[PDB]
Structures are given as structure tokens and as C-alpha cells.
Amino acid sequence: PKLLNRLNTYVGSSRVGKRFKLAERNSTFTTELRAGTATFLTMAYILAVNASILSDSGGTCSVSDCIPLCSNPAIEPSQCTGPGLRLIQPDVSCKFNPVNPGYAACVEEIRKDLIVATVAASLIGCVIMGLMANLPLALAPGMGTNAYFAYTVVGFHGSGSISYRTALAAVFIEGLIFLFISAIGFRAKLAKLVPKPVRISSSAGIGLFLAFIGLQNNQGIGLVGYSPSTLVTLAACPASSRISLAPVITSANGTVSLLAGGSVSGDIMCIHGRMESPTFWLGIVGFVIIAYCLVKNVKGAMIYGIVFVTAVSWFRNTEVTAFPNTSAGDAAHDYFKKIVDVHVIKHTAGALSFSGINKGHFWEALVTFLYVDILDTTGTLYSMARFAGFVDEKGDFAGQYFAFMSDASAIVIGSLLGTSPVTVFIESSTGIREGGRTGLTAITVAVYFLLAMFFTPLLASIPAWAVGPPLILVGVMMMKSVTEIDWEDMREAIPAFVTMILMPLTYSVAYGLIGGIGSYVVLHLWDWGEEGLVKLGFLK
Amino acid sequence: PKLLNRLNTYVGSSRVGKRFKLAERNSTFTTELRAGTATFLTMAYILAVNASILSDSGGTCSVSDCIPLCSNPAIEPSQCTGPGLRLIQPDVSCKFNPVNPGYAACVEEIRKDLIVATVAASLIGCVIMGLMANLPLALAPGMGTNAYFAYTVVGFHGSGSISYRTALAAVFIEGLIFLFISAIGFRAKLAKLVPKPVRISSSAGIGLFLAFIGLQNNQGIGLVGYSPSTLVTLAACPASSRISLAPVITSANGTVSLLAGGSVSGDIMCIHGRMESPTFWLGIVGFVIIAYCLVKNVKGAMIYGIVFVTAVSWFRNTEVTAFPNTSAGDAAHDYFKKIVDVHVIKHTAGALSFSGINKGHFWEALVTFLYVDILDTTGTLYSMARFAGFVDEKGDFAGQYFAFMSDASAIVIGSLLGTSPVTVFIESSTGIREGGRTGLTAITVAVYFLLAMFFTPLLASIPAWAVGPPLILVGVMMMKSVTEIDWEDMREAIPAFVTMILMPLTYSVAYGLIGGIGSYVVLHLWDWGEEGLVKLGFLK
Numbered sequence A, B: 001p002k003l004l005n006r007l008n009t010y011v012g013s014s015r016v017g018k019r020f021k022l023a024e025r026n027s028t029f030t031t032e033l034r035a036g037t038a039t040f041l042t043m044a045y046i047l048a049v050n051a052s053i054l055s056d057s058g059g060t061c062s063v064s065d066c067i068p069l070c071s072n073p074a075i076e077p078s079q080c081t082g083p084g085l086r087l088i089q090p091d092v093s094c095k096f097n098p099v100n101p102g103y104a105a106c107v108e109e110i111r112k113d114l115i116v117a118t119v120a121a122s123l124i125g126c127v128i129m130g131l132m133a134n135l136p137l138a139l140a141p142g143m144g145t146n147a148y149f150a151y152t153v154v155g156f157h158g159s160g161s162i163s164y165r166t167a168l169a170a171v172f173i174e175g176l177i178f179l180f181i182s183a184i185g186f187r188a189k190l191a192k193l194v195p196k197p198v199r200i201s202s203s204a205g206i207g208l209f210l211a212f213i214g215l216q217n218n219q220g221i222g223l224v225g226y227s228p229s230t231l232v233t234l235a236a237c238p239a240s241s242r243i244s245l246a247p248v249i250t251s252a253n254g255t256v257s258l259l260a261g262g263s264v265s266g267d268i269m270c271i272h273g274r275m276e277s278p279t280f281w282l283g284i285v286g287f288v289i290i291a292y293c294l295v296k297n298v299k300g301a302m303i304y305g306i307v308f309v310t311a312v313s314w315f316r317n318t319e320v321t322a323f324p325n326t327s328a329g330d331a332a333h334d335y336f337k338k339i340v341d342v343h344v345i346k347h348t349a350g351a352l353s354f355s356g357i358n359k360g361h362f363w364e365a366l367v368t369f370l371y372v373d374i375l376d377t378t379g380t381l382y383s384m385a386r387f388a389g390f391v392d393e394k395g396d397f398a399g400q401y402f403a404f405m406s407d408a409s410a411i412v413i414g415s416l417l418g419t420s421p422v423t424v425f426i427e428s429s430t431g432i433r434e435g436g437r438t439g440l441t442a443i444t445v446a447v448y449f450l451l452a453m454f455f456t457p458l459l460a461s462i463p464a465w466a467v468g469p470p471l472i473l474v475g476v477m478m479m480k481s482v483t484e485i486d487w488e489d490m491r492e493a494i495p496a497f498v499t500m501i502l503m504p505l506t507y508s509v510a511y512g513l514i515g516g517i518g519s520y521v522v523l524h525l526w527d528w529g530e531e532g533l534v535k536l537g538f539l540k
Ligand SMILES: *[C@@H]1O[C@H](CO)[C@@H](O[C@@H]2O[C@H](CO)[C@@H](O)[C@H](O)[C@H]2NC(C)=O)[C@H](O)[C@H]1NC(C)=O
Pocket: A071, A072, A073, B251, B252, B253, B254, B255
């Protein structure tokens, strides 16, 4: 026949072929590799997006890495010695604008570290899923939880109520509890705990949250900025025309002064030149490219858009350059000059700490992690089992037990390595749609991830206007779940709308879920009471 | 039979009864009055909401009404005479925080004027609709266009790119053009210009915009504020713990100073005490009341909630008092002391100006008004005609011509009196659902509006935490249109998502529409080109 056919048959007739039940599932070797390659092309974008989002979280280092600065910027701190000249001792404000150089270097190092951590976690998760449960699924850090971890639990540059290490501890404990409950089979009861409309609309809320994040400044293509009256208006003015804000003390005559201890914000206000930022238009070009590649049903759209924007952004003397002419820019260009490197985890490894188990926000974050993971994992796993045609009449696909256990173990390992919890990817559908049916798909994707590493230097130079449209379009894809809501029934409509609008506005998933559940319960209280009272017997 | 029956028969057998075709439509006198009363109860909330929203727009008066102020607040300007003491000449900054007293008095007077203007415009529109076209519909200022006029075209306290008078001129010209195009039957040709997904999702976008407005500080119940990092987080701290922001010039060492000419913002940042403002909880109580009244299908829910919140807020020495102990509070309490008054429009009457016809934003606002009015009026009028069973097979209900003409004339009259465009209300369905079929419903609603006036003093004391949930729930009701989108087709999904997310984030309807249409057109260029080229003959 053909060498492809000899290879297929030889693998099919081997012990390893029987291990994964190749013959019984009607595919031998080459369908598996094609499915794996398609899956990797579909979901490679995590490699950049997750690293960027987690790097913006501030990393493991604190004010201790802020160097003392001079009184005048023109004098370097080492030479800051003279009359009326002194050194400023770093404070909390060193972490924020204007950022201390030491913190910037720490942040870049943590960015590299997190890239490597993501790659390793995804590889190990894929291997475990492929081997223990023997299914053709792919695992990697979740998009929905990335931003919740980076911008809400920890905050921008560690401005949140939970320290990074305690956040990793929370993720670890959540993974352990998930493994426990999956083992003892209470999972269905907890999944039924949440009301239907909140469960349906939480995904749309998270999609809107990601879309909003993609429209900010230090996360995406700009186009949204501060306004003194409406608090949000049309950004995308040139970077040279952006200024910061500070808190002041008003009065009853018109005087104003700066409030000591004001937490200065970044460049968020535009003074002139709206809709003139070249980075915004480059991001728009990338967005349109990804949109076409999606509409024509071409796999790997987001990678093509990201790569085009990044390649354009690698030139050195442009307005959209990823290497601006300063010290940090020169260091970044130096690193990017070497194409391949083997970076080694140094700080994020084993960075757990159980100090903050007392704080309420700790348990809030843990419970939010737990519920999001339970619901999404169960739903996506059952959907993919349906897509592969493994579901029997009773509704189970045999190997569900070990699939859930493997997902929980992967979550725990990701927690240990220092990344947001890992999950199964809907992108795996592509592999199923290509004919792959056994665990070789997962191992192929794992090998492709292992190939991805060795390229840390190139993946470290992704600007926000490259991340951008990927996040926006992930939100677009996630929004499709709104249809399952009966919008004509107020008792079901109101909680869903609250859930959708609270997440992107309060900028926090937990508050959206809490508001939705509270509104649902308050609305249904009368029905609960009447039903229970008729059950008692006073009413009919 | 019964006096009700004699009255019914006597009216039915009279000339006036034949004028509205009473017998032909199977209702004589009392079904009409019941339908009118139900309609008025359903849609009375406009009386407060429209007045508040348009009053926040700043009115017709400019910095010329800012009085000169003293150097120290403890000295009144009249006595501001002494060493090192002087008078500050008002500039633009007088209009904003800290607001000059004269502008506050002007704003209150404009609020009263706008209340009376809304009442008169709604009355005249209802009368014209009921008489010329002879249908049981109700007219009043639109909710969606209210906020677009008040917060986007003109801006908060006249901070927009269009002067209030020129905005009224734009509304006038838009109404005239609508009348012209409707007269010639060319309306349906324009109505097909907008793509389907944009038309479908614009209503959901406007609903989200209203919901966002209802969650702000000077428009609703708070709960959304400013944050240096995420730009939006969880507000509803006590008013005593809110501070303002100002622009600042940073450096490369950590120094900061104020920027001359900074446009100070209102109290938007919370320093401590989150989720502790009593006004927020009172608004939540009103929201829950309205939600119950809606779920149980009780007419007049929003009025009951507004009235409860206002009645609680009318007390004098509480944290949620609508009369705080100052000069303006005392004046407002003085006015509210007299229950009934006959206020006469003094400024907003005949306030047109055609100076700015050159500006592009003028035409942007005009076209946005025109398209919103065209689409909404056509759709709602046809839906209400269907609901009453007047539609024939061909799809017309006879009196459509004069209905559209009456709506256009009402828009023009509203423009003359100084309010946002007037439209037909979906709430009229209630009157139809009760059995009303003729023009007596409109005249009854007009009489009820005429009754509403004479109560300007009471309607003038509505706080934001009373307006609040009404806006939020109007957004909830509007959101129901998302279902008509095929979320699985990207070429139709992406433009709709862009339209939905751009309106509430950029805080402008026109930009959302422009973005949606642009994305739609750019997405389909390949299809248009291929189709036209195959039409030419090169391809097959
Ligand atoms: C940081 O450097 C700035 C200059 O870039 C210093 O600005 C001082 O304050 C204002 C603004 O320039 C002027 O009136 C002074 O003359 C400036 N002095 C100097 C030496 O530039 C600022 O003082 C420096 N930081 C601190 C803490 O002083």
C-alpha cells in the first residue's frame, strides 16, 4: 500500500497499539498524529497569552527588589552623591508608576519563568490525561481563570488583598478538594447546588470580562480610557499624549492640593489626538486577520494573527516597536537576539505559603476556583465524550472516573509549579473532528509542547497589542451561551442579567456570582415559602 | 343592565363613537377607559426618569450664571472685602466640582422646566396619535435616546462637543427629515441599509448602556467607582469617604505635581468602607420591590418602587435624606413644602440654534437619532398593530401612514419644546392586552398626563438612588433581543458582539453603531467581491 500504511498496521498490531485500544476505535497511527497536530495548532496561543497575563500579576517579588533612587533622574543612583542630593528609600509606590527599575527587571525575569512554567504544566497534564484515563483530550491553563487570578485575586503588581504565594496555596487546596469530591462522587450534588440561570450565564459574564480586559491599555490595544465625567470613553490616542491621575482634596472655593499617599495611576487619560495610535491600528489589522482565518474555518487563526503582529513589532525604530530605546528595551532586545535558550524555573517553583488561610478573601477565591472548575470541567468533558461518540444510554463514557482524577492531579501539579489551574480545552474538539480517538493525540500534543520550549527568547517579546484580539475573540466565542436563557421569564432573566453585567463592571468574577445567586434566592424566596407551607398543609 | 352599560351604549350610538369606529372594534366606552388607566399606570415612570436624565445634561445656561466667589468659603462673596481677600472670576471650571452655586440654582430651575416640557410633549403627542391616525397607542420621550442626548451629545453639565441648543436643532432637523422620508414611502429602503445583526443587537447594546448608567454615582445607586489599576471596581462606600481625582505630571524619580487646567472629577474614589452606603441599600430595597411587582405581573411596579424610595428619602435628618442641611437643600425643601404648583417654562422653550451645522458631530448625532427612530418606530408600531389583530395578509394595517406622520410631528413638537425625541411606547401593549381598540385610550392617557402636571413640586425631589433600579430593569427588559442572533456563525456573531460591547464601554451609541457596521462590512468584503466577480464571469 504505502509506507503510511505499513506504519499504521505495524503500530496497530503492536502491544502499545493494544494498550490504547487502537483497533477497537477504528484508527491506527496517522489519524492520531493528524489530530494531535491540528489540536496543537488550534490551542498554541496559550503559550503567549497565559504567560503575559500571569506576568502582569507582579510575580513573587516585593518592594525589597526596588533599588534606592536619586533625587534627579539625570544622575544614576550609584553616582548620587553631592550637595542637596540624596537617595530615596523605596516604598510601596515603587511598585507602581513610575515603576522602579529593579521591579521591572524582576517582572521580566518572572515573565520568562512563567512561560517555562506554563509549558511544563501543560505537557505534564497532557501526558497524565492521555495515559491514565486514555482519552484524546488536551489540558492547559484556563483562559477564564487566568485573568481572575492575575487581576482580581492578586491584582496588578500585587495590589490585591491576597499575596501571590497564598493565592497559589488556595489553588492547591482547591485542587485537592476537587480530587476528593470527584473520588467520592458528590460532584453531581454540588453541581446541582447552583441555580440554572447563574450556571448558564457565568460563561457569558467571563467572556465579557475577557473582552473588557482586551480593550484596556496595559492589557491590550487600548481604545478605552478614563474620563472625568463618564469614567470610560474612547482612548487610542498616541502614548506621548497620555497623562496620569492623582487624588486631591477639594474645597468650597476652588482650591485643590495633592493628597499625601495618593496611589498614582498609569497613563490612562488622553489629552488630544484620539483614534491616532499606530499600535491600535496594528492590533485592528491583527484582529481582522484572525477574524477572516476563523470565518474561513482555517485552523490556527489566532497564532497567525499573533505572529503577524509580533513580527511587525520586532523592528527597532518604529512607533509600534516592541523594543523601545531605553535600558529595559536594550536588555529585551539583547535577550531576543539569541533565538533559542533553555530557561530554568528559579522563583515560582515551590512558592506556596499558608499564612493567609485566615482571611475571608482567601476562602472566596478558593470557592470561586472550585465552582468554576467543577462546572466547566464536567460540562466540557461530557460534551467532548458526546462528540467522540463514547456516551452510552445511561450517560457515562466508562473512563470518566480517571479523566476527572487526572484533571484534578493536573490542577495540583500546576499549583505546585506556580500557574493558574489547568483545565481541559474545548479546542480538543478539532482533534476529535479529525478522527483521533485514543491517547496518542494527547502524547503528540505533549511532544509538540516539549518542542515549544527551547524558544523562550522569542515568546518573551509579545506586546499587549498582540495579545489583544486573541482575548477579544475568545470572549466572542464564549458569549454564545446566552441563548439557553428564557429571557421572557423574569425570575430567570433578572439573575442572569445581574451575573452578566456585574462581572465586567465590578471587574471581579466572585462578586458577579454572589450577586446573581443572592438575587435569585431573594426572587424565589416567596415561591419556596409558599410551596413549603402548602406542603405543611395550611394552604392548598 | 347597569349604569356602566347605559354609558357604554350611549357613547356607542353617538357621533363621537362612530368617529373612532367603536362598534366595528367590539368595545364601547369602558374597555377604553380601563385600557387607558392601565397604560398610564404602566408608563408613568417617564415623568421622573426623563426629567432627571435631561436635567443632568446641564440645561441652557452657561458659565455666565456662575457668580464671583470669595477666597475663603467662610466669607460670603457679598462680604468678601478685606486684606488679602479678593473675588475669583468664574471660568469653565465653575461648572464642575466644586460646582458654583449659581449654576446649581440654574440647574434646578431647568429641572422644573424639563419636567413641565416632558409632560406637555407627551400630552400633545398622545392627542395627535389618537386623533389623526386613530389607534390606541401612547407616545412619550424615549428611554434609549434620553441618555444618548444627555450624556453623549451634550455631556455632563455641557462638557460635550455639541451645545444644547444645537442639539435641539439637530433633533428638529431629524424629525423633519423623518416626516419627509415617511411621506414618500422611501422609509423601507433606508430600513434595509443597516445589516441584520447590527439592527438586532443595537437594542441590547442600548440596554447594557442604560444598565451601566444606572450603576453609576450621580445617575443611580453607585456600586461602581474608580480604581487606579482596573479603572472600575466596587463602589458604594459612604459619601463621606469619597474623594476626587486630578491630572498630574509624573517623572523618572517619583516626584509629582498638579497640572494647571486639570478638569477635576466628582467624588468617584472610595478610600474605605466598601458596601456600607445606606443609599445603596435603600436602592436595593426598591429594586427588589420592583422585581417582585414585575414577577407577579402587577402593573405599575416601577412607580411603586420609585414612590417607596422617594417617600423614605423625604425625611429630613437621615443619611439617605433628599434634603441635606445646606442652602440648596433648604431651598429644595421650601419648594417641596408646597404640594401643588403651576410651573411655566421660561428657558427651554424655543431654544433652537443652527450655529453648529458645520461640525461633524452635529451630523453624527443627527444620523444616529434618525436611524434609531426609524428602526424602533417601525418595529414597535408593526408589533403593536399585530398584537391588536389589525394586520392583513399583505402586512399593512391601513392607518400606518398617519401613524408614522403623527410620530414625526410629535418628534418635531418635542424638539420645539426642548426634550429628546418622542416615540411610541411598547408599554401600550398593556392597554391593548386589556381590550382597548380605538383612539379613546390615547385621549385618556393624555388626560392622565394633564392631571400629572400641577404636581411639579413633588416630582422635583427624586434622588438618583430612586431613579436607579428603574433604569436597571429597563435595561433588563431591553436585553431580551439577543436570542435572534445566530451565535454559531462568525460573520454574524462578531459584528453583534462588537456592537454590544462598544456601546456601554465607549459610553456612546454612535461609536458602537459605527464599529458594528464597519466590522460587518470589512468581514464580508471577500464575499461581495467573489459574488460580483462570478457575476462578471471570470469565476464560476
Ligand atoms: C525628581 O526630579 C524632578 C525633575 O525632573 C524634580 O523636580 C523638582 O520640582 C519641581 C519640578 O521640576 C521644580 O520646581 C524643582 O526645581 C525640581 N527640582 C529638580 C532638582 O529637578 C524633583 O524634585 C525630583 N524629586 C524630588 C523628590 O525632589
